[PDB]
Amino acid sequence: VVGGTEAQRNSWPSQISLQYRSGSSWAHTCGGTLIRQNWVMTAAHCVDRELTFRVVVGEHNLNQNNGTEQYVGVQKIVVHPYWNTDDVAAGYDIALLRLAQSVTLNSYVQLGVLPRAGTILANNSPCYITGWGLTRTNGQLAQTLQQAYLPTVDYAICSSSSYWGSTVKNSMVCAGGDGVRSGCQGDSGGPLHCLVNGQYAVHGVTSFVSRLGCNVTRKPTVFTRVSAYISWINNVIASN
Ligand code: NA
């Protein structure tokens, strides 16, 4: 997250860190959302590589023990069957991870609330992105979880020529684009949290930013629209 602030430790308890095994070590690579005690929602592109992945729930500081972390292996990966890694602009950038164990819920670990199917946010709706991604273009991962206020940019503006044009689809949500605040690498797969009727729900799965940079004016961060995928998610969980 570029232009973020440090989140409080219990603000976003559905946020997870997706990590891969790297020699003797684990490395953060992506965000996700805990949506069942044994299921995580992330981006398909996050699991393109044939790696050993684990999920950390209750994480805050990636390089310090917080005393609240639970570490759980990924046992099964279900990628959206229409996802194409060499065509992120087509969409379908979504994947479900079944965990080897069910995690325990507490003030640091909770299920994300998903919007109702078909829900479309009005332009300029209030949302926050969260994650441990780069804090500058071509920078480095955050140590502690960051958040940034990213209001939505509706499809008619986002698919306009000076924004993303044909690259953005209605199966996506755009947010931000102010040139200062943005998602960045390492935030991919995590949540976009939007306040509706008093309650935060996870409306987006972070998918992509501009090849020119993370915080580019009129290139808002682009998210998979969760409310396009409610039946897909339910079908996968029901079948696994
Ligand atoms: Na930690």
UniProtKB/Swiss-Prot annotation:
Any one Pfam family match given in the protein's UniProt record, by short name: Trypsin
Active site: 45 (charge relay system), 93 (charge relay system), 188 (charge relay system)
InterPro entries: Peptidase_S1_Elastase_sf, Peptidase_S1_PA, Peptidase_S1_PA_chymotrypsin, Peptidase_S1A, Trypsin_dom, TRYPSIN_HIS, TRYPSIN_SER
Subcellular location: Secreted
Enzyme kind, highest EC tier: hydrolase
GO MF, any single term: serine-type endopeptidase activity
Gene3D superfamilies for this protein: Trypsin-like serine proteases
Chain's role: Serine proteases that hydrolyze many proteins in addition to elastin.
Record protein name field: Chymotrypsin-like elastase family member 1
Gene name linked to the record: CELA1
